[PDB]
Amino acid sequence: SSSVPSQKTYQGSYGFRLGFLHSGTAKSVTCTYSPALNKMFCQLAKTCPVQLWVDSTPPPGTRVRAMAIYKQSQHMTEVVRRCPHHERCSDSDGLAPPQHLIRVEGNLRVEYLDDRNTFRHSVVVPYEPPEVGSDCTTIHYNYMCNSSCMGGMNRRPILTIITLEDSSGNLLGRNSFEVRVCACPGRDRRTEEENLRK
Amino acid sequence: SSVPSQKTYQGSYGFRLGFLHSGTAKSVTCTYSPALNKMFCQLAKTCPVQLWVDSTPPPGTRVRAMAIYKQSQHMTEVVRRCPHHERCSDSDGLAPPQHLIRVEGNLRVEYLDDRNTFRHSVVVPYEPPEVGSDCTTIHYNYMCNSSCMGGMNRRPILTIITLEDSSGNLLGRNSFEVRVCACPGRDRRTEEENLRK
Amino acid sequence: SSVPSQKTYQGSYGFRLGFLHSGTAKSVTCTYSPALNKMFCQLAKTCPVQLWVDSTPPPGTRVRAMAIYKQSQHMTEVVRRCPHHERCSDSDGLAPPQHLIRVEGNLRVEYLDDRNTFRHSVVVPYEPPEVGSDCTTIHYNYMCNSSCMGGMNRRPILTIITLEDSSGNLLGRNSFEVRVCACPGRDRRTEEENLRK
Amino acid sequence: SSSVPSQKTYQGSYGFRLGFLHSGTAKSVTCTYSPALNKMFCQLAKTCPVQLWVDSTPPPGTRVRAMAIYKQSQHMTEVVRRCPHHERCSDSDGLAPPQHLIRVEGNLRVEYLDDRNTFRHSVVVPYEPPEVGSDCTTIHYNYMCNSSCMGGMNRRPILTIITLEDSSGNLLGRNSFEVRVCACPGRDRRTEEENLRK
DNA sequence: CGGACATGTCCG
DNA sequence: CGGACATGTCCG
DNA sequence: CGGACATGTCCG
DNA sequence: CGGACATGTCCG
Ligand SMILES: [Zn+2]
Ligand SMILES: [Zn+2]
Ligand SMILES: [Zn+2]
Ligand SMILES: [Zn+2]
């Protein structure tokens, strides 16, 4: 078992929030967000765009971490990792280690880290200020197993914790949302929102 | 070990316990007998205990659970998991493997071994009731059957729930009997049938 | 891999298979469909296959079981356990953990990986039927569901049972389809209902 | 897992057989044998007298081993040993290690052995010729857990294998019987014999 | 075992 | 925010 | 979940 | 070869 990171929202000196796109609940959707649930319902290995929203610009050098943990406290001390099967299916892009649940899509400066003590996985990319014509940076994350994967997540819910750091692994912003990698992100969102009444 | 009191003490905040009304189907996960004031539940399944209070108590208020043997011949013995279950590495990473009572769903859960009495207990910060709820629910697990050989060994037990401040002082006390067993509903029915002449 | 034949060959000894007639209750451990010639059984539960013979065959006669994929698109792929189950260390100490088919109850059980085809199979010495029995029973286990991801992956399979001498030569061949699944009875019923127009 | 010893009957140069006493099926019995089943139904830690029957006398020096194995082939490779609880209940007679299922009662020259490779337990006592007025030696064995012990035998059936050896651990005779340590050796015997018709 | 559904897949 | 099924799971 | 019972304990 | 119950388990 391994110790657990904070999930608490720390907006920080620079006003760190998160943005997700209007997506609907078409049983089929690649990726959809529940503002009510604070949870992404996305599909296996399909692009999950995350909006890095800010008040004011971080020091050049700043890195951006992602790390999944189990949500329930009875699994929080267990490392989130890929099922034996996907771990072995040769789906590496030549960057991401085959065991890592979270990948960053389309960026050469991506680092994948296995924590020295806790043994937890994460992926970091350098910060890069918003667009020419846009008020936030967007990262492209992929989830590499379904939440249901046998011998992996095993139908147990996770959080993604996105952290803003300087280049020493020191905190500057923190935010977090629930995640479900599933077949029909559309149908499951409705069913879980619809369950909120109770 | 010196036996902590169990004398129900509703207190300043009119604190009583509530439980789910879940019927007596054989293999119901958890079921409570009002007639017996006794929960019948399954090994390591979820056992909701409701906290009912009259007036919301102060901040930094804590909620404690401890088992004691109910018979007075066994009252001073520390209630513990059996040696089989203590060694089956079924810890969640948060509970000590010897502790019979667990709380799930709470990251602020704290486990205690008394330096004086050696008695296991488990505490969580008290929280005011949810959006429109009338009470706060706490989900406990019992990690050995009442029948565990070398553990409880068929001896009934009580769960003593204490409302306390940040300091350690009693604000409130309640208790109920527990049976942890394979068929909570079957057993509730038998023991209630056996009230009748 | 070169696909072994499955062409039923009753042989000199009038060897056919029999199976228990166990009904279609949802969670029946093992059940056989005559209409489908298909066993529906649960992961690692006991699956009696009866050997019926006309005239008792010679000594040192052996009995082999092997899985192949039934669809011809998948026929050459070696049937294997999935990566999860291969690594759950559920071996009995006698079976290799990658082998889907096991025999229980037999100390003379032998497991084989072909040096040519790489295909797993399992063999036991043939024994004449018991005290007044009409057949010899062999108890097999299937150690992955048909649905195992990275294993069978929802692809139906056949079990090829071969009667052979001490040497390796075919004396007898039969086969049936297997589904390993959580509800053998439910699934038998659905698939048979689906025969009808 | 550990390799499995032979159980096959080897009567040997000296005609090695076993004898058990007429005992009946009084639901209560300390110890009773089923000739039909070749199986002892006895109770936890109660005296199980085993008859060492012979044709002709073994070389002074000869030892007598007992070792339990599981009966079913799916457990035969697992070492038979005591449940965590009895293992810990301080019931040692100052000779038998707390982990050993089988003890020899009333004999000072008893050795308890943990096998060097397989890790299996056994207890050996020197051979001693029959009585002044008796045609066989009788050993007093005790079973130290019920077959049902949680984390021990776990309701799984065992064999006892009694071997005759010289003093180098070399074979001279072998015999074996099924065992059940239980609460009511009486009732269970009937029920298992009664099941033989089926 | 049912009921109810959790959750993947393919259908038209 | 598709529908219909394929196939595992949990609770009573 | 029932049915049926496996298997320990105490009863009169 | 006692009887009656206390309490876990497996199969359908
Ligand atoms: Zn996976
Ligand atoms: Zn226990
Ligand atoms: Zn599998
Ligand atoms: Zn024991």
mmCIF file of C-alpha atoms in Angstrom, chain C:
data_model
loop_
_atom_site.group_PDB
_atom_site.id
_atom_site.type_symbol
_atom_site.label_atom_id
_atom_site.label_comp_id
_atom_site.label_asym_id
_atom_site.label_seq_id
_atom_site.Cartn_x
_atom_site.Cartn_y
_atom_site.Cartn_z
ATOM 1 C CA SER C 1 -0.736 -23.363 -35.534
ATOM 2 C CA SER C 2 -1.826 -26.354 -37.613
ATOM 3 C CA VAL C 3 -5.397 -27.109 -36.446
ATOM 4 C CA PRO C 4 -6.008 -30.607 -35.099
ATOM 5 C CA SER C 5 -9.041 -32.359 -36.546
ATOM 6 C CA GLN C 6 -12.295 -32.488 -34.593
ATOM 7 C CA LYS C 7 -14.086 -34.949 -36.835
ATOM 8 C CA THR C 8 -15.971 -37.237 -34.407
ATOM 9 C CA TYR C 9 -14.538 -40.752 -34.778
ATOM 10 C CA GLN C 10 -16.296 -43.268 -32.471
ATOM 11 C CA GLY C 11 -13.684 -45.926 -33.255
ATOM 12 C CA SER C 12 -13.217 -49.620 -32.444
ATOM 13 C CA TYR C 13 -14.556 -49.316 -28.922
ATOM 14 C CA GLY C 14 -17.761 -47.393 -29.717
ATOM 15 C CA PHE C 15 -16.562 -44.449 -27.664
ATOM 16 C CA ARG C 16 -19.002 -41.617 -27.154
ATOM 17 C CA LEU C 17 -19.265 -38.927 -24.459
ATOM 18 C CA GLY C 18 -22.029 -38.612 -21.909
ATOM 19 C CA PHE C 19 -22.848 -35.604 -19.723
ATOM 20 C CA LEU C 20 -24.883 -34.959 -16.580
ATOM 21 C CA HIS C 21 -28.486 -33.806 -17.129
ATOM 22 C CA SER C 22 -28.482 -30.973 -14.723
ATOM 23 C CA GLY C 23 -31.220 -28.523 -15.804
ATOM 24 C CA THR C 24 -31.006 -24.793 -16.581
ATOM 25 C CA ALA C 25 -31.266 -23.035 -13.193
ATOM 26 C CA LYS C 26 -29.381 -19.720 -13.554
ATOM 27 C CA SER C 27 -26.264 -20.567 -11.596
ATOM 28 C CA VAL C 28 -26.003 -24.265 -12.130
ATOM 29 C CA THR C 29 -22.346 -25.199 -11.860
ATOM 30 C CA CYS C 30 -22.208 -27.185 -15.047
ATOM 31 C CA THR C 31 -24.965 -28.071 -17.536
ATOM 32 C CA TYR C 32 -24.919 -29.671 -20.992
ATOM 33 C CA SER C 33 -27.152 -28.848 -23.989
ATOM 34 C CA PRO C 34 -27.889 -31.935 -26.159
ATOM 35 C CA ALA C 35 -29.582 -29.657 -28.754
ATOM 36 C CA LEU C 36 -26.423 -27.593 -29.020
ATOM 37 C CA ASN C 37 -23.941 -30.267 -27.993
ATOM 38 C CA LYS C 38 -22.552 -27.602 -25.710
ATOM 39 C CA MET C 39 -21.528 -27.527 -22.045
ATOM 40 C CA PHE C 40 -22.203 -24.301 -20.125
ATOM 41 C CA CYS C 41 -20.167 -24.205 -16.984
ATOM 42 C CA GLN C 42 -18.673 -21.898 -14.358
ATOM 43 C CA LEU C 43 -15.034 -20.819 -13.952
ATOM 44 C CA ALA C 44 -13.093 -23.564 -12.194
ATOM 45 C CA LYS C 45 -16.111 -25.596 -11.133
ATOM 46 C CA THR C 46 -16.341 -29.327 -11.610
ATOM 47 C CA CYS C 47 -17.459 -30.482 -15.016
ATOM 48 C CA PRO C 48 -18.093 -34.201 -15.255
ATOM 49 C CA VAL C 49 -17.658 -35.685 -18.661
ATOM 50 C CA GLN C 50 -18.629 -39.373 -18.970
ATOM 51 C CA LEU C 51 -16.721 -41.793 -21.195
ATOM 52 C CA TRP C 52 -18.923 -44.429 -22.840
ATOM 53 C CA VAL C 53 -17.367 -47.386 -24.532
ATOM 54 C CA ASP C 54 -18.770 -50.634 -26.084
ATOM 55 C CA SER C 55 -15.896 -52.968 -25.331
ATOM 56 C CA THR C 56 -13.225 -52.206 -22.690
ATOM 57 C CA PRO C 57 -10.061 -50.947 -24.398
ATOM 58 C CA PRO C 58 -6.519 -52.227 -23.744
ATOM 59 C CA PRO C 59 -4.244 -51.291 -20.836
ATOM 60 C CA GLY C 60 -2.163 -48.082 -20.861
ATOM 61 C CA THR C 61 -4.982 -46.371 -22.760
ATOM 62 C CA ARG C 62 -4.992 -42.592 -22.270
ATOM 63 C CA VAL C 63 -7.664 -39.807 -22.395
ATOM 64 C CA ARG C 64 -6.875 -36.374 -23.854
ATOM 65 C CA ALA C 65 -8.651 -33.019 -23.748
ATOM 66 C CA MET C 66 -7.710 -29.933 -25.794
ATOM 67 C CA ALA C 67 -9.507 -26.660 -26.650
ATOM 68 C CA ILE C 68 -9.520 -25.132 -30.121
ATOM 69 C CA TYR C 69 -11.418 -22.078 -31.319
ATOM 70 C CA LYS C 70 -14.614 -23.025 -33.079
ATOM 71 C CA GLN C 71 -14.747 -20.176 -35.679
ATOM 72 C CA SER C 72 -12.350 -21.003 -38.583
ATOM 73 C CA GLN C 73 -10.978 -17.471 -38.550
ATOM 74 C CA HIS C 74 -9.592 -18.155 -35.073
ATOM 75 C CA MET C 75 -8.924 -21.854 -35.451
ATOM 76 C CA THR C 76 -5.080 -21.613 -35.657
ATOM 77 C CA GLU C 77 -4.694 -19.437 -32.560
ATOM 78 C CA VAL C 78 -3.681 -21.462 -29.449
ATOM 79 C CA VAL C 79 -6.431 -21.433 -26.833
ATOM 80 C CA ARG C 80 -4.954 -19.973 -23.635
ATOM 81 C CA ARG C 81 -5.861 -18.450 -20.268
ATOM 82 C CA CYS C 82 -5.970 -14.621 -20.176
ATOM 83 C CA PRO C 83 -3.146 -12.619 -18.684
ATOM 84 C CA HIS C 84 -5.061 -11.746 -15.488
ATOM 85 C CA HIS C 85 -5.909 -15.367 -14.656
ATOM 86 C CA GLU C 86 -2.492 -16.674 -15.740
ATOM 87 C CA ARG C 87 -1.014 -14.500 -12.972
ATOM 88 C CA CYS C 88 -3.496 -15.040 -10.138
ATOM 89 C CA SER C 89 -1.452 -17.954 -8.855
ATOM 90 C CA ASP C 90 -4.514 -20.286 -8.712
ATOM 91 C CA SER C 91 -2.492 -23.347 -9.738
ATOM 92 C CA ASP C 92 -3.072 -26.519 -7.760
ATOM 93 C CA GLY C 93 0.668 -27.209 -7.930
ATOM 94 C CA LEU C 94 -0.001 -29.722 -10.697
ATOM 95 C CA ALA C 95 -1.458 -27.598 -13.542
ATOM 96 C CA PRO C 96 0.578 -24.979 -15.436
ATOM 97 C CA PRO C 97 -1.083 -21.654 -14.763
ATOM 98 C CA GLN C 98 -1.610 -20.939 -18.519
ATOM 99 C CA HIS C 99 -3.588 -24.099 -19.181
ATOM 100 C CA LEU C 100 -7.334 -23.541 -19.535
ATOM 101 C CA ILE C 101 -8.395 -27.162 -19.018
ATOM 102 C CA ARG C 102 -7.557 -28.987 -15.763
ATOM 103 C CA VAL C 103 -8.366 -32.441 -14.425
ATOM 104 C CA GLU C 104 -9.165 -32.717 -10.709
ATOM 105 C CA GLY C 105 -9.299 -35.831 -8.575
ATOM 106 C CA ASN C 106 -6.570 -37.584 -10.555
ATOM 107 C CA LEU C 107 -2.970 -37.829 -9.266
ATOM 108 C CA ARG C 108 -1.813 -39.367 -12.605
ATOM 109 C CA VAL C 109 -2.907 -36.230 -14.538
ATOM 110 C CA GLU C 110 -0.370 -35.021 -17.110
ATOM 111 C CA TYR C 111 -0.177 -31.608 -18.831
ATOM 112 C CA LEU C 112 1.319 -31.175 -22.295
ATOM 113 C CA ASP C 113 2.529 -28.272 -24.467
ATOM 114 C CA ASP C 114 3.079 -29.486 -27.962
ATOM 115 C CA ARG C 115 6.624 -28.780 -29.231
ATOM 116 C CA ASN C 116 5.158 -28.275 -32.749
ATOM 117 C CA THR C 117 1.758 -26.629 -32.293
ATOM 118 C CA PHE C 118 2.298 -25.055 -28.858
ATOM 119 C CA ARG C 119 -1.158 -26.252 -27.902
ATOM 120 C CA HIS C 120 -2.044 -27.093 -24.424
ATOM 121 C CA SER C 121 -3.715 -30.383 -23.642
ATOM 122 C CA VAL C 122 -4.302 -32.588 -20.573
ATOM 123 C CA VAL C 123 -4.272 -36.440 -20.327
ATOM 124 C CA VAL C 124 -5.160 -39.061 -17.723
ATOM 125 C CA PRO C 125 -4.850 -42.890 -17.918
ATOM 126 C CA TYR C 126 -8.124 -44.445 -18.998
ATOM 127 C CA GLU C 127 -9.863 -46.547 -16.316
ATOM 128 C CA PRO C 128 -12.619 -49.194 -16.790
ATOM 129 C CA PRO C 129 -15.955 -48.170 -15.259
ATOM 130 C CA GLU C 130 -16.498 -48.439 -11.471
ATOM 131 C CA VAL C 131 -18.467 -50.984 -9.380
ATOM 132 C CA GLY C 132 -21.617 -51.386 -11.509
ATOM 133 C CA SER C 133 -21.164 -48.018 -13.290
ATOM 134 C CA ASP C 134 -21.708 -47.874 -17.086
ATOM 135 C CA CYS C 135 -18.997 -45.301 -17.687
ATOM 136 C CA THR C 136 -15.894 -43.604 -16.411
ATOM 137 C CA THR C 137 -16.256 -40.145 -15.234
ATOM 138 C CA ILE C 138 -13.594 -37.440 -15.653
ATOM 139 C CA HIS C 139 -13.929 -34.143 -13.841
ATOM 140 C CA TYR C 140 -12.536 -31.168 -15.694
ATOM 141 C CA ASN C 141 -12.189 -27.482 -14.759
ATOM 142 C CA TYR C 142 -12.206 -24.458 -17.200
ATOM 143 C CA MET C 143 -10.095 -21.805 -15.663
ATOM 144 C CA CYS C 144 -11.128 -18.696 -17.651
ATOM 145 C CA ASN C 145 -14.590 -17.467 -18.752
ATOM 146 C CA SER C 146 -15.313 -17.545 -22.515
ATOM 147 C CA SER C 147 -15.554 -13.795 -22.067
ATOM 148 C CA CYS C 148 -11.999 -13.342 -20.643
ATOM 149 C CA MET C 149 -10.430 -10.241 -22.147
ATOM 150 C CA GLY C 150 -7.016 -11.039 -23.664
ATOM 151 C CA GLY C 151 -7.910 -14.745 -23.387
ATOM 152 C CA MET C 152 -10.820 -16.360 -25.268
ATOM 153 C CA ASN C 153 -12.326 -12.987 -25.572
ATOM 154 C CA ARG C 154 -15.960 -14.167 -26.253
ATOM 155 C CA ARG C 155 -14.884 -16.603 -28.971
ATOM 156 C CA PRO C 156 -16.566 -19.969 -28.656
ATOM 157 C CA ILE C 157 -14.377 -23.010 -28.231
ATOM 158 C CA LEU C 158 -14.666 -26.767 -28.642
ATOM 159 C CA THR C 159 -13.253 -29.441 -26.296
ATOM 160 C CA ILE C 160 -11.709 -32.303 -28.218
ATOM 161 C CA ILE C 161 -11.627 -35.486 -26.255
ATOM 162 C CA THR C 162 -9.343 -38.185 -27.690
ATOM 163 C CA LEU C 163 -9.059 -41.843 -26.653
ATOM 164 C CA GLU C 164 -5.468 -42.949 -27.414
ATOM 165 C CA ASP C 165 -3.007 -45.798 -26.714
ATOM 166 C CA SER C 166 0.263 -45.562 -24.711
ATOM 167 C CA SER C 167 1.977 -44.475 -27.938
ATOM 168 C CA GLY C 168 -0.021 -41.483 -29.232
ATOM 169 C CA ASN C 169 -2.418 -43.145 -31.755
ATOM 170 C CA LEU C 170 -6.108 -42.314 -32.050
ATOM 171 C CA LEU C 171 -8.505 -44.943 -30.798
ATOM 172 C CA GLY C 172 -11.470 -42.564 -30.501
ATOM 173 C CA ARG C 173 -12.497 -38.910 -30.883
ATOM 174 C CA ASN C 174 -15.337 -36.675 -29.718
ATOM 175 C CA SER C 175 -15.920 -33.026 -29.040
ATOM 176 C CA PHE C 176 -18.352 -30.456 -27.700
ATOM 177 C CA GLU C 177 -18.663 -26.760 -27.482
ATOM 178 C CA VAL C 178 -17.964 -25.012 -24.177
ATOM 179 C CA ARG C 179 -19.174 -21.763 -22.766
ATOM 180 C CA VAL C 180 -17.568 -20.793 -19.448
ATOM 181 C CA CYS C 181 -19.720 -18.070 -17.960
ATOM 182 C CA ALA C 182 -21.299 -16.711 -14.767
ATOM 183 C CA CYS C 183 -24.792 -18.167 -15.349
ATOM 184 C CA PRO C 184 -24.628 -21.506 -17.199
ATOM 185 C CA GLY C 185 -28.385 -22.147 -16.830
ATOM 186 C CA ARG C 186 -29.451 -18.683 -17.928
ATOM 187 C CA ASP C 187 -27.229 -18.857 -20.945
ATOM 188 C CA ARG C 188 -28.292 -22.423 -21.892
ATOM 189 C CA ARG C 189 -31.905 -21.284 -21.889
ATOM 190 C CA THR C 190 -31.245 -18.157 -23.969
ATOM 191 C CA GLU C 191 -29.212 -19.934 -26.580
ATOM 192 C CA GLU C 192 -31.740 -22.740 -26.901
ATOM 193 C CA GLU C 193 -34.701 -20.298 -27.053
ATOM 194 C CA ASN C 194 -32.728 -18.711 -29.950
ATOM 195 C CA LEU C 195 -32.826 -21.960 -31.967
ATOM 196 C CA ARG C 196 -36.563 -21.427 -32.427
ATOM 197 C CA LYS C 197 -38.038 -19.118 -35.190
#
